[PDB]
Amino acid sequence: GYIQRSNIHEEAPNTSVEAKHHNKTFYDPILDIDEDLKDDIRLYGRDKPDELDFTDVWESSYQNIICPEYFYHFWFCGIVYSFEPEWTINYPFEKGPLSPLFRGEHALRRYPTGEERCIACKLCQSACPARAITIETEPRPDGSRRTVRYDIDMTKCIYCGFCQEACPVDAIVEGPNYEQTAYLHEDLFYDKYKLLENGDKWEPQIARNIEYLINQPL
Amino acid sequence: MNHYWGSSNTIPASSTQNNNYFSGGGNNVTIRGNEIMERLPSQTPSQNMVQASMKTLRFYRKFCRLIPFILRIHNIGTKFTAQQAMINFGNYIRERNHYRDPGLIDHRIQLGYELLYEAEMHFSQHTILMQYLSPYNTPLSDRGYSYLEKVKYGNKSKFLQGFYKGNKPTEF
Amino acid sequence: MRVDYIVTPINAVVSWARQGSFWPLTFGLACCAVEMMHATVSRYDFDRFGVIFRATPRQADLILVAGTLTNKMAPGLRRLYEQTLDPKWVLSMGSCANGGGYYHYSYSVVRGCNRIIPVDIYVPGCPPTAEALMFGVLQLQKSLYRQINEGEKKYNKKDLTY
Amino acid sequence: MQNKYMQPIQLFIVFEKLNSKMWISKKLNSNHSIALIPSNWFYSINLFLKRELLFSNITLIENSAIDTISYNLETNQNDLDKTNIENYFFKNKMLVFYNYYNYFLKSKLTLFIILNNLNKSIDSIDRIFANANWLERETSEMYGINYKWKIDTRKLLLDYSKIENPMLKEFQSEGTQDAFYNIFENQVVVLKNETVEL
Amino acid sequence: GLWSWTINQMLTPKFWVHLRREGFIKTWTRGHKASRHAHYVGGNRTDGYTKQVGEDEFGNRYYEDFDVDHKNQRRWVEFSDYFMQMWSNGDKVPVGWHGWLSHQYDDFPTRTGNSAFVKHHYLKQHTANLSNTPLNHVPQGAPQNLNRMRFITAQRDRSRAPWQSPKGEGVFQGKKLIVASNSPFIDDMSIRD
Amino acid sequence: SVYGYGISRYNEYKRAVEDKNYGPLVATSMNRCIHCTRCVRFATQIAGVEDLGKTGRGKAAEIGTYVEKTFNTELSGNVVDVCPVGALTNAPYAFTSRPWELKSFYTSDVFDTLGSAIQVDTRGPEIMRVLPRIHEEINEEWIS
Amino acid sequence: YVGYRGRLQYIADALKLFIKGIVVPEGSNKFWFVAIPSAAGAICYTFWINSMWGPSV
Amino acid sequence: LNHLLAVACHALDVGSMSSVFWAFEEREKLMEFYERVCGARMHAAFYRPNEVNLNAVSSFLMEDILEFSRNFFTTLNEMHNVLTYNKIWKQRLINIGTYSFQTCLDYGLTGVMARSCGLKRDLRLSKTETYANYYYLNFRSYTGQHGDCYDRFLIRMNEMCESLNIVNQSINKISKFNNIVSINTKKNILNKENFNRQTTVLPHLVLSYLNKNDYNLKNTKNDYNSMEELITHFKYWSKGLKVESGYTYQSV
Amino acid sequence: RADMAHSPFHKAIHDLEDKRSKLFPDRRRIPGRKAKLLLAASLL
Numbered sequence A: 001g002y003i004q005r006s007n008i009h010e011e012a013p014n015t016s017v018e019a020k021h022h023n024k025t026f027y028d029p030i031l032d033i034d035e036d037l038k039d040d041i042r043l044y045g046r047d048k049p050d051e052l053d054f055t056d057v058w059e060s061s062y063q064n065i066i067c068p069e070y071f072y073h074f075w076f077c078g079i080v081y082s083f084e085p086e087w088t089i090n091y092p093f094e095k096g097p098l099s100p101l102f103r104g105e106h107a108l109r110r111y112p113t114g115e116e117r118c119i120a121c122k123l124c125q126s127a128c129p130a131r132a133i134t135i136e137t138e139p140r141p142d143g144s145r146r147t148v149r150y151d152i153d154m155t156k157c158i159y160c161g162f163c164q165e166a167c168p169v170d171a172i173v174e175g176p177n178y179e180q181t182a183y184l185h186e187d188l189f190y191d192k193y194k195l196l197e198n199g200d201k202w203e204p205q206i207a208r209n210i211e212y213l214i215n216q217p218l
Numbered sequence B: 001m002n003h004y005w006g007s008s009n010t011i012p013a014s015s016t017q018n019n020n021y022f023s024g025g026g027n028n029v030t031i032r033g034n035e036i037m038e039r040l041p042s043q044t045p046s047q048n049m050v051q052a053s054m055k056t057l058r059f060y061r062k063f064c065r066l067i068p069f070i071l072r073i074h075n076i077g078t079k080f081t082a083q084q085a086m087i088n089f090g091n092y093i094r095e096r097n098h099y100r101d102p103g104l105i106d107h108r109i110q111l112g113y114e115l116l117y118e119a120e121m122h123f124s125q126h127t128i129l130m131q132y133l134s135p136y137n138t139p140l141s142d143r144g145y146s147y148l149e150k151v152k153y154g155n156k157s158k159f160l161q162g163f164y165k166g167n168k169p170t171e172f
Numbered sequence C: 001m002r003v004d005y006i007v008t009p010i011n012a013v014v015s016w017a018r019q020g021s022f023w024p025l026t027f028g029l030a031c032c033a034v035e036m037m038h039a040t041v042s043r044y045d046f047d048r049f050g051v052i053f054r055a056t057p058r059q060a061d062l063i064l065v066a067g068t069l070t071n072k073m074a075p076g077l078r079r080l081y082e083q084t085l086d087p088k089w090v091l092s093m094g095s096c097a098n099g100g101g102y103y104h105y106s107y108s109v110v111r112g113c114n115r116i117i118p119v120d121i122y123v124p125g126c127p128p129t130a131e132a133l134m135f136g137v138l139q140l141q142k143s144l145y146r147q148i149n150e151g152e153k154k155y156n157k158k159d160l161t162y
Numbered sequence D: 001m002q003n004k005y006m007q008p009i010q011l012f013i014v015f016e017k018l019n020s021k022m023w024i025s026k027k028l029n030s031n032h033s034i035a036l037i038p039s040n041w042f043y044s045i046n047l048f049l050k051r052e053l054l055f056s057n058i059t060l061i062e063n064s065a066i067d068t069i070s071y072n073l074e075t076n077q078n079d080l081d082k083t084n085i086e087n088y089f090f091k092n093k094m095l096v097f098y099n100y101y102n103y104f105l106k107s108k109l110t111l112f113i114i115l116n117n118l119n120k121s122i123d124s125i126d127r128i129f130a131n132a133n134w135l136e137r138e139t140s141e142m143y144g145i146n147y148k149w150k151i152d153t154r155k156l157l158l159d160y161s162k163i164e165n166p167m168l169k170e171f172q173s174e175g176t177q178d179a180f181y182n183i184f185e186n187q188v189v190v191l192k193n194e195t196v197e198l
Numbered sequence E: 001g002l003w004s005w006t007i008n009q010m011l012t013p014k015f016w017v018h019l020r021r022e023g024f025i026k027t028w029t030r031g032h033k034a035s036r037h038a039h040y041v042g043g044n045r046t047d048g049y050t051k052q053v054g055e056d057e058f059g060n061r062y063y064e065d066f067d068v069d070h071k072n073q074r075r076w077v078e079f080s081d082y083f084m085q086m087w088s089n090g091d092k093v094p095v096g097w098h099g100w101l102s103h104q105y106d107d108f109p110t111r112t113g114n115s116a117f118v119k120h121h122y123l124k125q126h127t128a129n130l131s132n133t134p135l136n137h138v139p140q141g142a143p144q145n146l147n148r149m150r151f152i153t154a155q156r157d158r159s160r161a162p163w164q165s166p167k168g169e170g171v172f173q174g175k176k177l178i179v180a181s182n183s184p185f186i187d188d189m190s191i192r193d
Numbered sequence F: 001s002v003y004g005y006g007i008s009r010y011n012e013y014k015r016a017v018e019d020k021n022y023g024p025l026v027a028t029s030m031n032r033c034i035h036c037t038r039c040v041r042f043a044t045q046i047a048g049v050e051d052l053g054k055t056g057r058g059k060a061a062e063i064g065t066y067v068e069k070t071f072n073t074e075l076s077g078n079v080v081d082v083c084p085v086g087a088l089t090n091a092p093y094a095f096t097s098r099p100w101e102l103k104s105f106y107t108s109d110v111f112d113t114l115g116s117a118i119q120v121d122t123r124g125p126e127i128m129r130v131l132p133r134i135h136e137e138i139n140e141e142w143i144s
Numbered sequence G: 001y002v003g004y005r006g007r008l009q010y011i012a013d014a015l016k017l018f019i020k021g022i023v024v025p026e027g028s029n030k031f032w033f034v035a036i037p038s039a040a041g042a043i044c045y046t047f048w049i050n051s052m053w054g055p056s057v
Numbered sequence H: 001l002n003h004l005l006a007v008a009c010h011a012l013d014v015g016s017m018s019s020v021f022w023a024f025e026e027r028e029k030l031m032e033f034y035e036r037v038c039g040a041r042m043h044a045a046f047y048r049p050n051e052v053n054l055n056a057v058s059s060f061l062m063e064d065i066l067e068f069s070r071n072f073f074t075t076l077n078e079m080h081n082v083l084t085y086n087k088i089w090k091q092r093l094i095n096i097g098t099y100s101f102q103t104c105l106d107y108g109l110t111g112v113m114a115r116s117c118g119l120k121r122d123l124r125l126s127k128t129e130t131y132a133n134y135y136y137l138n139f140r141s142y143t144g145q146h147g148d149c150y151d152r153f154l155i156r157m158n159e160m161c162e163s164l165n166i167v168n169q170s171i172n173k174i175s176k177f178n179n180i181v182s183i184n185t186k187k188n189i190l191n192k193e194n195f196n197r198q199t200t201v202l203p204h205l206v207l208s209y210l211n212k213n214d215y216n217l218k219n220t221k222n223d224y225n226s227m228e229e230l231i232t233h234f235k236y237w238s239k240g241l242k243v244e245s246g247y248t249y250q251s252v
Numbered sequence I: 001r002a003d004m005a006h007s008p009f010h011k012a013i014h015d016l017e018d019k020r021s022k023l024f025p026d027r028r029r030i031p032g033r034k035a036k037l038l039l040a041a042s043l044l
């Protein structure tokens, strides 16, 4: 590609018993019997061998009359594979394994003082591949820049996490919650009240996960 | 003829006979064929406007021949008669009269044949394909109509009618 | 008044049965279909809650829209909904079905399957994990169990409904 | 570079009446050659490719078209020379490209054709390569390309009862119609659309 | 719900220990609070029952057993509300217990002492899914909102505020109608000196 | 982004500057100033007012008026367009919008009988800001 | 979960199948459409007479 | 993942009902492996043009991947012994959909189908077309000699096995095997508090060895304590990166 | 070489005879044995 290669042939490793990395029992005479079967012409095309034999006669008679497919597979599947313990996770009473990186329901966070982290920078709005975030901003009477509107269409969202990566104050996050099934299409129109209460309810778990994620680079 | 319109692509009259004895026959013009269409080759290029006009006339003739079958199978015969549907599609073609590029006309004829085949094989929905057969300035025949704006804006010009009725919502 | 003495108990037996055997239609579009098929296999067994898939709409009780709906498919979805036997319920799974989704601004996609057929419940993710799909199906089962007697009738002086 | 490469120059040796314009780039694979081909020789060139030795073991990998009527350099406008292939994207109504792979020579070959007629007419090669049927159908429906001598001209991916070329630059990604259910007709209809904007 | 503890599961030392300590109603209902497996009631072992790792603000109990046949069944919760089969769903698990039960981390909430979770003054309590209830999420302009007009009017007035026309009887000077100005700002140059 | 090294190595305290009040049209964030003198030169040579300057020395020098004085003048907002950084910003146009979510139209002004060539930036049905254009026969580069 | 530990699944399935409301499409023979299932049920509810449980039982 | 789903669904179509339950359980573990690096089970959006989330990859993840490989051998053998030698399976798949290299070229067939028609075409093993460490590993590729459904099925199973082998080779390439031994008695000196005591896999040893300068800068400066990095973050997430004009074609 | 014998990339190189015996079959299938046995037994 971008380098030179004087010798393209990769030579096999040293086969001497004196060598340090000699691997005995790599080749098994019982198992490795490919020399017996490699000369068969049936493995190379539609052609037939020069001479058929009574071994083939016996094999065909066994296959056609005994019909082993009804006892080989039946036993070997049914009994043995039924002996194995089950794999089911009892969903109402157990949960499947997640990670702190799991992308679930969106939430808006606060500082430990109770102040909003979001400063209406609109980076999350432009980061959204689905155009699901709409933001409008006015100066709050105390002077700080805050959103007068921050809403996300959860029926447009693809749950990709580009917005939580774009946020420079960790204001918008995707929480661990996934049980957000709704009965109305209007219940999935998330406004600032919904995201704020989601953040105020899920703050401990989100804080723990974000703490671990922050400590990972450190 | 190895084509969907071939003279041998007719549905047999009976299970043991293509037609009555002593002869053969079948209908392939006013109804669909026996086998499905598997390929639709390109129209032979037209070197001048005469060939393009002939192609348009022949496509319109095929469409007119297929109208009653489409109306029956799509249950749209009460909205308009066969002649009304032909006249509406002729209005469409007349609105496409100003064309003067033969290659563009060949492309349009290919598309028209494709849409006609879609209509005659239940590929499209009747409420969707009726957009080509609907009248331009007349109500449909399967329902009543309102003539309120005819009475109030009787002798008023088109501008006044479009001024009294706005072009945008008024709440916002 | 006296008819309720028979109707009110029997109602439960009618609901329980249809809550115990809730057969959805075998129909999957795009990749919420793959997620749903994951939700059907042994890790999350719908067969635990008596949910088994039937291939024809005449034997189906729940229509599960689980993928993108294009303008080419809307009449087919409408026909499939109309051809299911009553009573029936509709579950909308994933963003492409709940709304436009990742293709909301496209020229050939229906902006939500509820523009064509009524929807009973929406599952938001893209894709919603098998956890969330099972949650939504269980919620729908409980709702349709309770849906036969929601207290619509008034009680007279004998504590009897109408 | 660091591999054996040779231009596909025999193609223009056999077709003695054609100009030769070829490019190689480090943005492509080191065995990928791009050439410019006139439209009125495309069918004969594909006929030669399909059967000539050291070309016969070839397959058609991809086909598509570029709407260059709105192609503009956005940065570094002063770093363009007369040898840049993008220099052929100006003033040209349409472009069509085909990509093949040759197993004997282990090479990628891309051919570019400039369409400068308003009807966008070009001969089809689906009678030579069986790939070109669906590929050319999709290209024709997306970009309005008029393919002549084609096996099948029907629409491939677009909706029934509609005529449009959504991949042209003039087309807005939201289209012009929306599909709704109509209670008064108990079936789905299409209406002029009003859409949200971000 | 008969035989929450089967006969084979009974006669086990675990069952008698649980009955002696916890009682009958608590022991019997453990088969109804969780319905994982017949042999799993009270824990997979037989010498004793699994100690609960914790409890809940709504009464749910959380256990972790390391002797389960499959790795995924290590941790589970028994709910305080078990009225019917197919009654308790997965949205009833609170925040820290959600992460513990989904194996995100190995920390779990504690009532008292050194906690691994923040306890701020603005935190709200976990609520279950409130859809299909009178307390669902309503957009500010949706028809379900009784105060939808205040939101609609403000959005309209952001870019086009209508002029308030005079109403009722007014004062006339010829043909001009006299009203007081609506400016909240002060014309200080007419009062200054 | 285009010409710099792309990463930093400065790891000390930066200087901090207290903000000044110039009036309801110009907002000041003087930590962002790069001492480019564009505002001083615009005020002296274009606006004709002599209220701006550079006081101090070295890194601690500051741009602006020495005393608490408003930047009251016509063509005042133009100085914002001159300043390359967010040191001086359009105070009415504070925090409301971002450049990428605006559509622009070319038109002419009617507030004064000079038909100033202007650019109107809108977001949906709301007009968000007005900027000057280049004509060289009307308003040069500037608007009132 | 239908009953306790799934002890009534068949009962629930049978009751739901009773509850479901059948519709006969147009273009089909209604008499035959309803009569073939009746004949099939009558035939299938006869197999139990061709059974043997011990000698001459 | 893909070959598991394909084989299971093909068996389900043919009539083997149970095999789909197994491949879906064994592809749940790979979905968990996705979820542990990006937080999603299907749509990762993981690969980036010039950025790699190095912190998302830990040594504890590779050991679980090796465990999965060891058990995937057994699950693949379980699927093997109900399909491969089954008479019904052979009579359903053998000599079905047979084609040669000429059709395989006319219809642009690549991948498993092209290896079944007999053609040796693998982009990973091509000298001029390889990508992402594939050219410097050692694995096998399989071609059929009949061009039918049976060949495709066998090729897919063998490709799954070879994928296991490639994963093992990569983990070995990011592993630290040799240790420090005592000068006398040739006895190993294992660390007590170092992270390398927990496991032999260090997924950052090659990167830190060669690109030490870039490793240091990335681990010290972010958009919270550097002006250049904050400007880069803002431009990247507001307008995106700028790409110089040109045409490219890239295949995988 | 990781795909050929005696490769230094391989790790399990020392005496693993017991594990190799336990994990893998120790007898070779011989054609006709089952056929002849089953046919003769069925006839008898």
Ligand SMILES: CCCCCCCCCCCCCCCCCC(=O)OC[C@H](COP(=O)([O-])OCC[N+](C)(C)C)OC(=O)CCCCCCCCCCCCCCCCC
Pocket (backbone or CB within 6 Å): G031, G035, G036, G038, G039, G040, G042, G043, G046
């Ligand atoms: C006709 C198609 C080809 C038939 C091939 C031979 C079929 C042999 C029988 C297979 C089973 C289906 C037949 C039974 C159901 C339909 C009855 C029928 O054909 O009626 C036609 C006859 C005549 O059909 P018709 O009334 O529609 O015809 C009107 C007259 N012409 C022909 C001019 C239009 O029906 C009647 O006379 C009225 C309905 C009587 C139905 C009585 C039986 C109902 C089913 C009871 C259960 C089955 C019997 C008991 C169980 C079995 C024995 C243990």
Ligand code: SF4
Pocket (backbone or CB within 6 Å): A117, A118, A119, A120, A121, A122, A123, A124, A125, A135, A163, A166, A167, A168, A169, A170, A171, A172
């Ligand atoms: S990305 Fe973060 S800081 Fe920016 S507008 Fe959004 S929530 Fe606010």
Ligand code: SF4
Pocket (backbone or CB within 6 Å): A127, A128, A129, A130, A131, A132, A133, A152, A156, A157, A158, A159, A160, A161, A162, A163, A164
């Ligand atoms: S997760 Fe992705 S699609 Fe969803 S709101 Fe955030 S950026 Fe948009």
Ligand code: SF4
Pocket (backbone or CB within 6 Å): C029, C030, C031, C032, C033, C066, C067, C068, C093, C094, C095, C096, C097, C101, C102, C125, C126, C127, C128
């Ligand atoms: S909502 Fe998303 S994940 Fe679901 S089917 Fe649609 S595209 Fe696939």
Ligand code: SF4
Pocket (backbone or CB within 6 Å): F032, F033, F034, F035, F036, F037, F038, F039, F040, F063, F082, F083, F084, F085, F087, F088
């Ligand atoms: S334009 Fe800005 S950086 Fe330049 S001198 Fe003025 S306040 Fe400073």
Ligand code: SF4
Pocket (backbone or CB within 6 Å): F032, F084, F085, F086, F087, H231
């Ligand atoms: S946007 Fe400009 S003036 Fe504002 S802080 Fe960033 S780089 Fe400086």
